Amino acid sequence: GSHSMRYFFTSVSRPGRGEPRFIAVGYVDDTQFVRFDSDAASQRMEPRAPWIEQEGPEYWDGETRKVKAHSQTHRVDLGTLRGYYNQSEAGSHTVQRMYGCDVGSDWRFLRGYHQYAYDGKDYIALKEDLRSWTAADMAAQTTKHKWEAAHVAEQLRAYLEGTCVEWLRRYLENGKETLQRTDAPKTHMTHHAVSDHEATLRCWALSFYPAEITLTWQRDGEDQTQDTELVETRPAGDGTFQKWAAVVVPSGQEQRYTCHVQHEGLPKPLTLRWEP
Amino acid sequence: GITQSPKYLFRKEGQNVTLSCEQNLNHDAMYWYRQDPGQGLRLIYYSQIVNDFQKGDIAEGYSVSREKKESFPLTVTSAQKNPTAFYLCASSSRASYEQYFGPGTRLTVTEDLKNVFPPEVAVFEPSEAEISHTQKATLVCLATGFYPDHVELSWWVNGKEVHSGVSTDPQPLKEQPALNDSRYSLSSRLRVSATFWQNPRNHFRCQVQFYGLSENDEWTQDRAKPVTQIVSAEAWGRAD
Amino acid sequence: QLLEQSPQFLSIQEGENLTVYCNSSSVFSSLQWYRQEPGEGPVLLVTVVTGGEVKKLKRLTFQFGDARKDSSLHITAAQPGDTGLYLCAGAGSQGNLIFGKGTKLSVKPNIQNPDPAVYQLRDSKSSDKSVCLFTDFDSQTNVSQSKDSDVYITDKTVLDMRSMDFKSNSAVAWSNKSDFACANAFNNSIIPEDTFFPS
């Protein structure tokens, strides 16, 4: 099936006088493989998975050099934005940045990304054509006119369609023993009473890879979002994930309901119910 | 704009020297190059953003800094034993986009300050044979005996600088080719009509600006110290 | 990344039309051209971006190849103000410009009436002392350098009398050597058989 590579950058200011902090992390699908942190001792890009550790010293020195340059760019950007928005130097402010590529079953280019946020909200994004920009307001219009005149979009599109996709195919081959695996969920059901007319059923999915899943409730016909409480997919911490879906039903009809599980590790989609 | 100073610089072997580069263009990125005679550009060091720099292709024995957006100084250390060169600085609005170049600096490194010499200058009058054969008259200027080759030559007629009828050699000649710090020679020509040269009210002058020693440098020799100075020679028209 | 320029050297005549080349295996997102005179800052002439784009400046016409892997620079009715080193450059992935090593162009005046001659000039403010002047020869004549370490021979330069509308090549030779004669000064080069040597 399909695969992806992503980098995430966070840059935060402090009152004074106080120096700003910078963090970068990288991911192949749902597996983190590197990090950088300006507050840390090493001042190096560092490994976070065992397959990246087989890159030699030329690889490590080049990622470190490139990330320090990134970090000084976003230091300047914090002061620029407080100027565009007429703010003071007494607060704390946040810039974020994400870029990367998707590939298909064939391992060929599918989609690319490159976008920013200031204080929570969208600032400027590259569109899916990889040719034009979305500016969210008057300040970000200044950023757009500056990047159009210096031809930033053309150089970004080359990276995203070529280089980016080549790093990802290399990482998939080197990390084959773990990156290519797909783990099917181990499933079960729980039941607690609340009162005499209603009780909570809960459908459980455990130990799957990757994170992508769908869990939907039905009764006789199809979908309902009536107290259909579902929680965000969470990491188990050993490289697999977990999820639950739960509905509160009229007590007595606890046999007309069916839970549905869709995962790419499953040979066939799963339907299960509660037995008396 | 973007500025380098000075145009010409001169030092002894073993002396660290720092070259200037400033711009008020509002650019983020700055670059340094070295260039040898009849050769291409070679990238030394570069800086994509204030407070960060990285090495080019020939970085050994040089260093840089970038504490401010406007300025990017280059230090030539007791580098490699290859410091004599033409140095160029450039800036772009963001890294990888079109570069604007400063005017350039010539640095020459010497074995010994006793090798420094100012030019002597002489004008040669037009031959009679040329005048009757062509109805034209060519004057020749020679500047000889100078080291380093850091000079500017100009012609003056009746108090005014001329560029019409002039050609100066694009490069000097070494006097002793076998010697590392050889002195240099340079020629120029001025061609006028024969009726212009035959007017005894016309006054011609060859002027050479030389760049040499400073007030900083010692001079413990018996000959006059080879400082920055102008050296001239002249002629007046002659009737027949 | 690598850019390769061809030819390395081109020497042609005033009023000729010409094209020079820049090539790669890989694609560039933006490309520039510069012109440089020796001892001077290069001057930016153009930036190109779109595959297939044409731009014109003064007597110059620039073309970007459709796949973005090459570019050409064309001069129409070339003039001696076009003489110099022409350099192509493109956006580098590590935050710089990738440069080619260049094409060095000379544009030569047309000498309508060549009059090859060697003359002797005397020092103005001196007894003795003189130079020899080879002048008025055509633009295909080669001036060699000397077999003697005691004799000095320059390359040729071109001079322009603007109000009379007239141009000429010349070389200069001199020596302190005591037998030195303008008659034998230019003996090392191939010199026109009908060169005027004043009696």
Partner: peptide, 9 residues
Amino acid sequence: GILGFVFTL
């Protein structure tokens, strides 16, 4: 691997 070129907003 990450981008080799950087630019200000």
